[PDB]
Design a protein around this ligand. Sequence first.
Ligand SMILES: CC(=O)N[C@H]1[C@H]([C@H](O)[C@H](O)CO)OC(C(=O)O)=C[C@@H]1O
Length: 370
Amino acid sequence: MASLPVLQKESVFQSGAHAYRIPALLYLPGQQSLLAFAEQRASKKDEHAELIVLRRGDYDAPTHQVQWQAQEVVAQARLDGHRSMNPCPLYDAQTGTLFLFFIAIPGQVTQEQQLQTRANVTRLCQVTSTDHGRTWSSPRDLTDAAIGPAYREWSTFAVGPGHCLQLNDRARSLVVPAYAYRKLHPIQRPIPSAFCFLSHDHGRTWARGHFVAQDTLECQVAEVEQRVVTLNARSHLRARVQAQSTNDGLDFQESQLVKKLVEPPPQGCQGSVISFPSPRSPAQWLLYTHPTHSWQRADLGAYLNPRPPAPEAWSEPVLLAKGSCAYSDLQSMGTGPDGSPLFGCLYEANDYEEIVFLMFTLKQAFPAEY
Ligand SMILES: CC(=O)N[C@H]1[C@H]([C@H](O)[C@H](O)CO)OC(C(=O)O)=C[C@@H]1O
């Protein structure tokens, strides 16, 4: 009945003068620290979003606990007159550059206004850091270069939220998960589909991967090794949509509903997925966190896939948190104190009144594998 006993459970963000939503977590292996991002909003409503905040956490080996420094606004992550949303961090292990992708929307123009008028006013931006997130560059609007001609083809769009991916391909490509409401029919309402922005030159130039042939919203990607990019997306079909790409994110040749991974009504909820070194035939396994309630957003659970990307290989969930739970973001942190893979998890709880940090090992979550 009680949730999973974990190495650590701590509220890193709480409602106060501002509300906090949309967590994003990034582990910096060489720094042994975590970057927890979130949207600082004037209220819980989406259009009241303002800026992006950040807390740097340091993992202490002797105590196997993470101590978090004070939150601070990522001042550079914004466009004049625009509110910032959807933080999507990424660490380029080859250049050491830290990327923070996000979207910027004029004042309080809602997503609904853009959908109803089929008029896109959302911007794709990024800020980078060469000192691991301590200081950030001026924002760069990627809209023209990354979206260009397709801009008029979408009612609106977003990236993430959550951590991105860097492939172990030749060019060490950067992959940013996203979705867009595409204007396909003259009368029918534009349908959203997930896809990935791609960069083969470490963020210098960008291109758009093709759409998952499914009605999908927020998604995240992971790579498993031949080399496959598995995409896990939110959908209104009461189940998650999972798609695989064997051509590094450009196209998703296969996709389907994973009924075992429930989505609450009426339009599901965002979830997170990551790959990590297998404790044993396949090289990597997958971990996925998401609410497990079928009627509302509650009971955050962790699922395991020991034979990725096989949809039928997803395990039954393990209860991570009881009660109201929503968005989450996962990160593989290496080896835990018990010799098994260590994981960090950031998630919205208690009717969006706090964002909780959870840290646990594979041994704790899935002991049957041991
Ligand atoms: C950019 C934006 O408004 N994102 C919002 C997202 C979006 O409405 C949905 O993915 C369909 O477009 O939904 C939710 C949500 O808690 O369900 C909060 C996000 O802030």
